[PDB]
Amino acid sequence: SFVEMVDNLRGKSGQGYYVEMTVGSPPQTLNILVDTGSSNFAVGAAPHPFLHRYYQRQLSSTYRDLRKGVYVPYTQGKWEGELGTDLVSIPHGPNVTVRANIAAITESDKFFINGSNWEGILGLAYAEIARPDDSLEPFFDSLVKQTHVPNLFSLQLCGASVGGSMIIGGIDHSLYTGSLWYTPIRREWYYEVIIVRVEINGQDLKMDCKEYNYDKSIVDSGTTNLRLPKKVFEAAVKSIKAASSTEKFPDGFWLGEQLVCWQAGTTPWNIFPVISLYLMGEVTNQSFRITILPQQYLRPVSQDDCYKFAISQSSTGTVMGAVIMEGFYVVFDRARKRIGFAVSACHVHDEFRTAAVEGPFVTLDMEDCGYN
Numbered sequence: 504s505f506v507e508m509v510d511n512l513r514g515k516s517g518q519g520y521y522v523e524m525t526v527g528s529p530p531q532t533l534n535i536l537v538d539t540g541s542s543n544f545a546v547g548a549a550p551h552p553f554l555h556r557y558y559q560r561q562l563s564s565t566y567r568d569l570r571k572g573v574y575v576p577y578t579q580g581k582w583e584g585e586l587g588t589d590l591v592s593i594p595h596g597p598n599v600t601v602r603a604n605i606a607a608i609t610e611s612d613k614f615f616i617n618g619s620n621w622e623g624i625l626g627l628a629y630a631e632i633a634r635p636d637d638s639l640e641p642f643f644d645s646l647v648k649q650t651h652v653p654n655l656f657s658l659q660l661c662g663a664s665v666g667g668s669m670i671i672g673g674i675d676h677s678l679y680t681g682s683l684w685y686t687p688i689r690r691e692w693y694y695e696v697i698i699v700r701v702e703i704n705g706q707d708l709k710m711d712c713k714e715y716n717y718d719k720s721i722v723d724s725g726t727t728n729l730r731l732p733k734k735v736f737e738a739a740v741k742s743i744k745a746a747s748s749t750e751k752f753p754d755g756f757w758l759g760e761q762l763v764c765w766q767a768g769t770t771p772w773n774i775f776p777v778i779s780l781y782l783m784g785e786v787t788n789q790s791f792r793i794t795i796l797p798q799q800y801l802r803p804v805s806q807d808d809c810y811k812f813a814i815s816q817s818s819t820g821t822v823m824g825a826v827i828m829e830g831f832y833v834v835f836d837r838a839r840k841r842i843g844f845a846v847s848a849c850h851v852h853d854e855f856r857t858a859a860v861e862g863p864f865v866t867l868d869m870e871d872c873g874y875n
């Protein structure tokens with residue numbers, strides 16, 4: 504089972520992964536970004552230069568107008584829409600059709616990306632961060648309530664046309680290897696977690712573990728990079744720099760501005776360190792760590808192989824984005840309020856190193872790593 508859902512994700516590097524969904528009756532097909540960093544089901548519902556398709560409510564016999572608007576400011580830009588409901592389904596997902604809240608995006612400024620394969624967003628986080636308020640039930644919540652699909656989904660984000668799998672309602676064994684280790688979901692808004700220790704090539708970053716989670720640490724498929732707090736990013740980069748000093752790179756590379764290139768097939772992966780995040784475990788004083796390779800944080804972008812540094816600075820806490828998720832099979836066990844990590848069956852590595860998920864490790868005062 505779940506074979507119907509395997510490989511149901513596609514994507515364009517740096518733009519996220521999208522699943523195919525249909526909305527309305529008769530069904531209208533759209534590509535919806537899979538975002539565990541937001542909680543709205545929003546879709547383009549009016550003409551736009553970047554949208555080559557859009558939700559046409561007037562053509563759905565099953566549409567219902569909630570007669571309420573929503574205004575979402577996004578960085579330097581925004582989107583606005585009319586809230587409503589309609590029948591939604593996932594062609595390559597569970598065989599269910601559900602009535603869900605839909606934010607019909609009717610106006611936007613600097614939101615939709617020029618030439619992006621997706622026309623909407625599927626916010627899989629919790630209601631607390633749903634716009635305009637926590638009373639707009641997130642899609643996955645309606646899905647679970649209206650069907651018998653277990654309260655759980657898993658993501659295998661593979662990279663370099665990127666692809667992956669979103670398994671709704673189960674765990675597909677062929678998507679990972681070894682063990683799944685679970686970290687508790689600290690609070691149900693974002694998929695917030697607690698990082699209790701960071702290593703660069705085995706060397707402890709040695710910071711107040713509260714810094715790692717300041718002001719929070721989330722798992723966000725809607726973010727490309729691994730984004731770390733300023734103090735943490737600064738330390739991580741210093742350490743990553745030291746670890747790879749056999750070659751020097753322009754300060755622009757460490758800022759994600761400049762690229763770094765090598766003769767096709769000669770990328771010096773080994774001079775780059777691995778990165779380990781220790782996550783709070785399910786058992787007392789027990790943690791586990793997930794380790795990613797340069798193949799994860801060096802985003803491929805001629806007859807050379809060129810890459811961009813995919814670790815960047817955050818002011819809104821740690822974001823375990825695609826850079827992290829692409830090394831692992833990530834299980835969002837909402838039912839049990841925990842997130843599973845297993846080595847991904849599709850992650851990119853070489854013959855000497857591999858992403859890892861190891862445990863347990865004795866760790867005291869893990870609660871103290873949580874920032875308030």
Ligand SMILES: COc1ccc([C@H](Cc2cc([N+](=O)[O-])ccc2OC)c2c[nH]c(N)n2)cc1F
Pocket residue numbers: 517518519520536538539540541542543545575576577614615616624626634723724725726727
């Ligand atoms: C409910 O309101 C929003 C939901 C999601 C986003 C973006 C989605 C997005 C993802 C990627 N992407 O690269 O996956 C690129 C561009 C995007 O928006 C244009 C986002 C930001 N962070 C998260 N989790 N998602 C912005 C919103 F205003």
